[PDB]
């Protein structure tokens, strides 16, 4: 039947290597059996488009001009890939609209420009309205979640997704503002202020500049915002995920360490900071490696003022704040300690070194002991102790490991205190969860950190697909309702390759058991186990030190060096002991106790989170990066199309197009709509009673369908039944009155 639409003047989409899809118009009517189409391109040139001799499949028809730039993609006549790309291009380039709906899921595009599209009057304008009675915006999602939590008394979750830089961090912040405003009616409104204040604090400690993002979010965050019976904020709790430790000691060619170090170095001249004995960021190796200590459009000194102000608002006094700056200053002074070689396998550090002097002074430690333990290691046996001198390379490695460890304890200490400030005495009626996770990334060189983040992103896709596609269509099959299968790309195989008993993480952990274990040996074990036995896993022709894996977004090559070390993540017992013995109270609090590998800990942490998400009603936001140049309102078609297919956008709209998301059991429907039924319509069979009543209430049979155990409805029909229920109760009250 679709071939009847291929008439003279009809428009179609044809594949193009650079533009992905090109629009063309038919110069003649198509007849079944024709091998070439005479097309007029929009550039003024005529083309003979040859059809496939085996399949005879025609190019995609283009939707009418009235359907260009629609608020909801389900309004399109032809629901195919070229149509999606065109509709989003027009709304972005022409209309400057960043938002579009794909049913319940929201699509967000990064503008690379500040626009005033979120005044409190806008917040008020989105408040109190229906879905679609406002145009697409993040506030609509927030309001829908607010509306659902209040009516359903069910916890909700806001899940944002996308590759690095797509606007995801930005989206979560604005959603929180909406809830804080509505809740703002409270007496102890300071709690909402504290909740919003949490974000900039974590950004200072948690973010750093990458080539992808000037403010990359190098840890994960999940926030539960609790509500009372009044549907007003009671408090909150943050659960966070693995921070990039390698960032403290290393930075690439145009990257920085965490923002807070630069804020502290910018404030070195102030009298309060004088005790720290700091200089500019160029003086310390841990800050200098990147080659550029400043971010354009950012004033580190100004940010330092804001960060301090944020700390005081949470109730963190100046003594606490000066205490954290001391730790950070100490990490910088440790980074420039001079270490000299003795013979081939020994090292020595002088008790005279200027940087180690202030390090020992700030930490409240003995210089002579630190010189000894940076140069030697202890081996303890039941009967005796043995000492091994360390090489120059080992001394610097030992020093750096301690720096990562200190920074890690410090980050955790801060989040614990914000959670203490965010705590609530009252009982939780319900909650809204917000997820903010580092997005898919790739570089010239990729390591263990990229492996972990990509693996986490794979899990998010699995949760999304399980809920949206898998769980949902399986129900229709069991329900015995006419259903056409909707295809999706299932990533379960790569997930098994990573997580299963035979998986990559398990093999790395087994290599960690062996003292003889090596990255080379592990890579060889991966090749032996999977080189030609697996389709998701492959090795490049030129290398034996790296491997490539097929993720949902793209294939990624990972270098094997450092994987066992990074999986172990440990520090010498003597160094931790000298810090446990420190004179400064904060250091002993971290070093006091306030076997599984980082990879094992990471898997379970993600499992607990997946389980947590499954308990709530999800609300998904898909963020897209339009261009790599960071330019205002520029659209890259090749780059966009790959993100759309990776996100499964088209199939999400096709499943949405099938409709019937709402589903009442015959018992629930009967119990809720008994008032719309006359006593004569109530048969011994509840199922037949519901059929007879629904057939009387709704005349169009295309708006509802009957399954084995549930009744299915099209959009707006339950609201119509609620209007009828409300009208019947009102009429009954008037009759009684
Ligand atoms: N509302 C916005 N207005 C302007 N630029 C934005 C907006 N949202 C995101 N961006 C741009 O996208 C970049 C990355 O988005 P952000 O949410 O900050 O981090 P990410 O998207 O990586 O989570 C920002 O640095 C900024 O350049
Ligand atoms: Mg981010």
Author numbering: 2 to 593, 598 to 599, 632 to 770, 775 to 778
Task: Quote the study that presented this structure, word for word.
Myosins are molecular motors that move or move along filamentous actin (F-actin). Myosins comprise a motor domain, which can be divided into four subdomains (N-terminal, upper 50-kDa (U50), lower 50-kDa (L50) and converter), a light chain-binding domain and a tail region. Primed myosin, with ADP and Pi bound, rebinds F-actin, leading to Pi release, cleft closure and generation of movement, proposedly through swinging of the lever (power stroke), towards the barbed end of F-actin (+actin)13 for most myosins. Here, to address these issues, we performed time-resolved cryogenic electron microscopy (cryo-EM)4 of a myosin-5 mutant having slow hydrolysis product release.
The time-resolved cryo-EM data contained unbound myosin-5 molecules, providing us with the opportunity to directly compare myosin structure in the unbound and actomyosin states. Unbound myosin motors from the 120-ms data were analysed to produce an EM map with global resolution of 4.9 Å. This revealed that unbound myosin motors were in a primed state, vitrified before productive actin binding. The myosin models for unbound primed myosin-5 and primed actomyosin-5 are very similar (0.80 Å root mean squared deviation from global alignment of the motor domains across 708 Cα atom pairs) yet subtle changes are seen in the flexible regions, especially in the position of the converter domain and helix D. When the two structures are aligned on the main actin-binding interface (the HLH (residues 505–530) alone), the entire U50 is observed to be displaced with the largest shift in the position of helix D. This suggests that subtle structural changes in the myosin motor are induced by actin binding and propagated through the molecule. The movement of helix D results in the rearrangement of the position of Y175 and Y119. These residues interact with the adenosine ring of the nucleotide and the rearrangement probably results in less restraint on ADP in the nucleotide pocket.
